[PDB]
């Protein structure tokens, strides 16, 4: 709307909204993807466990 004033008629079918309308949305993301477990840099690492 350009806010044009009619010469004889009145544009009563146009109005400015004041507040938004809340609606129900559909589903979204399901879950997270794969993640890493354990440390690869530590695999096969030699560990000293000999007693005194």
């Amino acid at each position: 709307w350009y806010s044009p004033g009619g010469g004889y008629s009145q544009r009563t079918d146009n109005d400015t909204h004041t507040h938004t309308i809340s609606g129900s949305v559909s589903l979204g993301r399901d879950d997270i993807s794969r993640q890493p477990i354990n440390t690869l840099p530590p695999f096969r690492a030699a560990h000293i466990w000999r007693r005194i």
Binding site: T39, L40, F43, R44
Partner: protein
């Protein structure tokens, strides 16, 4: 396309590797860039280029 970046992936020959990681590079980084090891995420910046 402009802005949109088709997500890619880098599947290795084997199922998994010991401490496997990818140092993703992007030739002509202005056109697009990638990050991560498995996923790429080739987000484009320029509107034309290879």
């Amino acid at each position: 396309s402009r802005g949109s970046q088709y997500i890619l992936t880098a599947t290795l020959s084997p199922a998994n590797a010991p401490n496997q990681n990818i140092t993703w590079t992007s030739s002509n980084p202005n056109i697009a860039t990638v990050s991560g090891t498995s996923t790429q995420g080739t987000i484009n910046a320029l509107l034309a280029g290879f």
